Enzyme design. Structure first.
Site, mmCIF file in Angstrom:
data_model
loop_
_atom_site.group_PDB
_atom_site.id
_atom_site.type_symbol
_atom_site.label_atom_id
_atom_site.label_comp_id
_atom_site.label_asym_id
_atom_site.label_seq_id
_atom_site.Cartn_x
_atom_site.Cartn_y
_atom_site.Cartn_z
ATOM 1 C CD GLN A 100 8.876 3.528 0.544
ATOM 2 O OE1 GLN A 100 8.093 3.969 -0.296
ATOM 3 N NE2 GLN A 100 8.590 2.483 1.318
ATOM 4 C CG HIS A 181 9.647 0.669 -1.641
ATOM 5 N ND1 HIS A 181 9.228 -0.586 -1.253
ATOM 6 C CD2 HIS A 181 8.535 1.327 -2.049
ATOM 7 C CE1 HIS A 181 7.920 -0.684 -1.419
ATOM 8 N NE2 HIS A 181 7.475 0.464 -1.902
ATOM 9 C CG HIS A 184 4.632 -2.955 -0.921
ATOM 10 N ND1 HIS A 184 4.394 -1.678 -0.459
ATOM 11 C CD2 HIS A 184 4.382 -3.784 0.120
ATOM 12 C CE1 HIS A 184 4.017 -1.733 0.807
ATOM 13 N NE2 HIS A 184 4.002 -2.999 1.183
ATOM 14 C CE1 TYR A 186 5.777 -1.124 -5.142
ATOM 15 C CE2 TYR A 186 6.077 -0.485 -7.435
ATOM 16 C CZ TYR A 186 5.260 -0.627 -6.334
ATOM 17 O OH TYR A 186 3.933 -0.243 -6.393
ATOM 18 N NE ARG A 233 6.410 -0.116 4.763
ATOM 19 C CZ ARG A 233 5.148 0.250 4.567
ATOM 20 N NH1 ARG A 233 4.723 0.607 3.362
ATOM 21 N NH2 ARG A 233 4.315 0.288 5.598
ATOM 22 N N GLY A 323 -0.949 4.300 7.525
ATOM 23 C CA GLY A 323 -1.005 4.875 6.194
ATOM 24 C C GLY A 323 -2.267 5.675 5.938
ATOM 25 N NE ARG A 324 -5.566 1.619 4.029
ATOM 26 C CZ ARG A 324 -5.962 0.360 3.876
ATOM 27 N NH1 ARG A 324 -6.804 0.047 2.902
ATOM 28 N NH2 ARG A 324 -5.531 -0.581 4.702
#
Ligand code: FMN
Ligand code: TNL
Length: 364
Positions: A100, A181, A184, A186, A233, A323-324
């Site tokens: 990414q 990316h 989120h 960025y 994404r 993810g987690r």
């Protein structure tokens, strides 16, 4: 037992043996100076090679792109060499890995920018949040973001070139795919959102102008490598990292998707909600996205295997990125297939540090 989650899926130039993907996860354990990936990082990714597809932690396309101490880059010779070892490790275990690529934009701090200068963005508006740096002992610490400088019109071609070069580097580094990316809050998302973009030139204003940068980047990387090697994404619905998608988020999102579809890229990865609250995607919206994008669609955001099976079965998405659960379960594929219990998560070690809370989670 389950059903579709463990069936193959063609993703651009590669074929995933299952639809359980590993979401991109910033872990901030790279070497400084140099923002260099480490053998430990390689071990961590190798442990998770059974994933249908591993999407790496966000990686800088340039030194200027840096916003977090400990995040790796893919712009220097040393970084390319280190990543080559990591991808080889994943491939040694028959896995697939995408890198990414990002530019943090205003989510950064002057102390980690070239020359210690102010970071860049669409406009000169502070993100009003914090990023992660490291202290005198290399420990992760939180620090308020530095107010950014608005990119000059003549500086944009350079940004596009940096993404292009990073993708060229990713190909030599052995990555199977690249994920841009554009979510989120960025850099790319900073331009996409009217809340963070107040430009009056052709890169601000209308949705066409706000999406201009990301599309220029997509075209540049498709040309540099191949469209079937490119993924992206986005987090077009809701509010993330303080950056909120405009008042016409759905319409703007569908515009972006139709444009992306024209490039015939490998996949569309949708981060549905931040980490905090967030209104869920309606099936009506998923259908509108579905009919506009002809490649693989990856869903993400507090997904359960049940939700993944439900949506894949409905033909609304093709794979799910966890993810987690992947942080805590290297063999998540096997666990979900066997309906085995998962290892408990240890949030305090998600960022920074070493092996503890990183290569620490056992497989079955
Ligand atoms: C420790 C951590 C680091 C993250 N870093 C990234 C990343 O580098 N890039 C990104 O796009 N999202 C990142 N995310 C978001 C995840 O990819 C994912 O969308 C999110 O964790 C929600 O999925 P989950 O409920 O399955 O964990 C991060 C989240 C966590 C908890
Ligand atoms: C997407 C994301 C990060 N990133 O690489 O852009 C970094 C994060 N972090 O806290 O280091 C968190 C992120 N997230 O979860 O949205």
């Amino acid at each position: 037992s389950a059903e579709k989650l463990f069936t193959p899926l063609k993703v651009g130039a590669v074929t995933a043996p299952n639809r359980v993907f590993m979401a991109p996860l910033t872990r901030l354990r790279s070497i400084e100076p140099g923002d260099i990936p480490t053998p430990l990082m390689g071990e961590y990714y190798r442990q998770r090679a059974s994933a249908g597809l591993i999407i790496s932690e966000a990686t800088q396309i340039s030194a200027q792109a840096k916003g977090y101490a400990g995040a790796p880059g893919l712009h220097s010779p040393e970084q390319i060499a280190a990543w080559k070892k990591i991808t080889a490790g994943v491939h040694a275990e028959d896995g697939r890995i995408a890198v990414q690529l990002w530019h943090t934009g205003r989510i950064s701090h002057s102390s980690i920018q070239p020359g210690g200068q102010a970071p860049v963005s669409a406009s000169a508006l502070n993100a009003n949040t914090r990023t992660s740096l490291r202290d005198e002992n290399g420990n992760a610490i939180r620090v308020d973001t530095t107010t950014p400088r608005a990119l000059e019109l003549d500086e944009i071609p350079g940004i596009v070139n940096d993404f292009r070069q990073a993708v060229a580097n990713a190909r030599e580094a052995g990555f199977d795919l690249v994920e841009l990316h554009s979510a989120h809050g960025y850099l790319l998302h900073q331009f996409l959102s009217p809340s963070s973009n107040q430009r009056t030139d052709q890169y601000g204003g209308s949705v066409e102008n706000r999406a201009r940068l990301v599309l220029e980047v997509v075209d540049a990387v498709c040309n540099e490598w191949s469209a079937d090697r490119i993924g992206i994404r986005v987090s077009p619905i809701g509010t993330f990292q303080n950056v909120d998608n405009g008042p016409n988020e759905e319409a703007d999102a569908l515009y972006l998707i139709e444009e992306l579809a024209k490039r015939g890229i490998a996949y569309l990865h949708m981060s549905e909600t931040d980490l905090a609250g967030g209104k869920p995607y309606s099936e009506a919206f998923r259908q509108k996205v579905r009919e506009r994008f002809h490649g693989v669609i990856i869903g993400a955001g507090a997904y359960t295997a049940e939700k993944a099976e439900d949506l894949i079965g409905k033909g609304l998405i093709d794979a799910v990125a966890f993810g987690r659960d992947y942080i805590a379960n290297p063999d998540l594929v096997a666990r979900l297939q066997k309906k085995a219990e998962l290892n408990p998560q240890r949030p305090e070690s998600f960022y920074g540090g070493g092996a503890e809370g990183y290569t620490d989670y056992p497989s079955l």
